[PDB]
Amino acid sequence: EDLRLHLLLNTSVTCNDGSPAGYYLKESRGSRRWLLFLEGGWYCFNRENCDSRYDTMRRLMSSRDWPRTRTGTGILSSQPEENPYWWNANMVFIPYCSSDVWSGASSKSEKNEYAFMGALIIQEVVRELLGRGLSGAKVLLLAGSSAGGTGVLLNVDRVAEQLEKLGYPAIQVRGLADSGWFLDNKQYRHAPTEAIRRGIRYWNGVVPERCRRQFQEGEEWNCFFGYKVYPTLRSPVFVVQWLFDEAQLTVDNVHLPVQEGLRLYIQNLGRELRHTLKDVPASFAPACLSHEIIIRSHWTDVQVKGTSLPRALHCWDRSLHTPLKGCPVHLVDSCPWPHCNPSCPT
Ligand SMILES: O=C(O)CCC(=O)N1CCc2ccccc21
Ligand SMILES: *[C@@H]1O[C@H](CO)[C@@H](O)[C@H](O)[C@H]1NC(C)=O
């Protein structure tokens, strides 16, 4: 039970219900690598659906029932057997308790039943970790899965800007976005663009500055879609995305003998996803029907073109020291149907 809970000392930075947000930390003395992982878990965007989430998903809205420890798994494991990539790093798990895809900057108040403080939670965790050893870091990898993967895209450059202004320009900030690269595509039957548009207003959601300047007022929802926000980012970002992501299929109103219309729909989804990753140099996109990878204990098992994700991430680290012999970083399946890759999760 190796990561220990710390509630934020700034208790004005809160989960949805006003309880303090926080982070779980396992230090690694002598490592200058820091991994900050953003949990996922959908979102809510109005009073009624946030109230329902509060009834049955309360740990995603409140710290009141959080345990004092959590076990690090996958990329958060400290065992090299489970985590070939960063087993010796300082590990931080940031629970998702803001329901805002890590974008919010609004407090609970006279006018607001809930606080949506995801963007401020990340900033406050960073600021409090600086006094716990992060000041000595050489690399800060902001990672996340699901809504936390989108949260990486939305926040990695702000973490970089925050550290620059605080006087730490030597800390290299990088992003690892897992299962947070979604398409605003046609549904199979006739959605996130509208839910996100409403959420931004309900949350006081913030997006990266260059993306905001491109899309402008009322169109900031566009910045929640990876293929649109990614080209605006300055920090190096590695993108992990199943080609047939289960959350993508859910928001597309697909639920799984497949007939021609659905076959063509699924094949087109994989082709569109692949297309959006063509110019993403650090990416890992297997042709599987699944969701999330990096904190799963068996995350080492899947391979694209014979290369596992821990290996690809290691090659990315080397690339950030011309391509490297036998150590690739751009790994996107080309086969067109779920589980055409034999290494897909069972
Ligand atoms: O992965 C998760 O936690 C669940 C799904 C999720 O979060 N989705 C799906 C659609 C979308 C568009 C923009 C931002 C986020 C999301
Ligand atoms: C606490 O967090 C709030 C919201 O981000 C910020 O405005 C304020 O400066 C912080 N206060 C302290 C003492 O860190």
Swiss-Prot record:
Entry EC number(s): 3.1.1.98
Keyword Nuclease: no
Gene Ontology terms, MF aspect: palmitoleyl hydrolase activity; phospholipase C activity; protein-containing complex destabilizing activity
Tissue specificity of this protein: Rarely expressed in adult normal tissues.
CC terms in the record's Gene Ontology section: endoplasmic reticulum lumen; extracellular region
Key words of the record: Glycoprotein, Hydrolase, Phosphoprotein, Secreted, Serine esterase, Signal, Wnt signaling pathway
Record localization: Secreted
Record's keyword annotation contains Transferase: no
Glycosylation sites: 10
Induction summary: Up-regulated in hepatocellular carcinoma (HCC) with high intracellular beta-catenin.
Active site location: 146 (charge relay system), 245 (charge relay system), 291 (charge relay system)
Enzymatic reactions: [Wnt protein]-O-(9Z)-hexadecenoyl-L-serine + H2O = [Wnt protein]-L-serine + (9Z)-hexadecenoate + H(+)
Single GO biological process annotation from the record: bone development
Reported impact of residue 146 to A: Abolishes enzyme activity. Unable to mediate serine depalmitoleoylation of WNT proteins
Catalytic class of the enzyme: hydrolase
Known role: Carboxylesterase that acts as a key negative regulator of the Wnt signaling pathway by specifically mediating depalmitoleoylation of WNT proteins. Serine palmitoleoylation of WNT proteins is required for efficient binding to frizzled receptors.
UniProt record similarity statement: Belongs to the pectinacetylesterase family. Notum subfamily.
Protein name, as recorded: Palmitoleoyl-protein carboxylesterase NOTUM
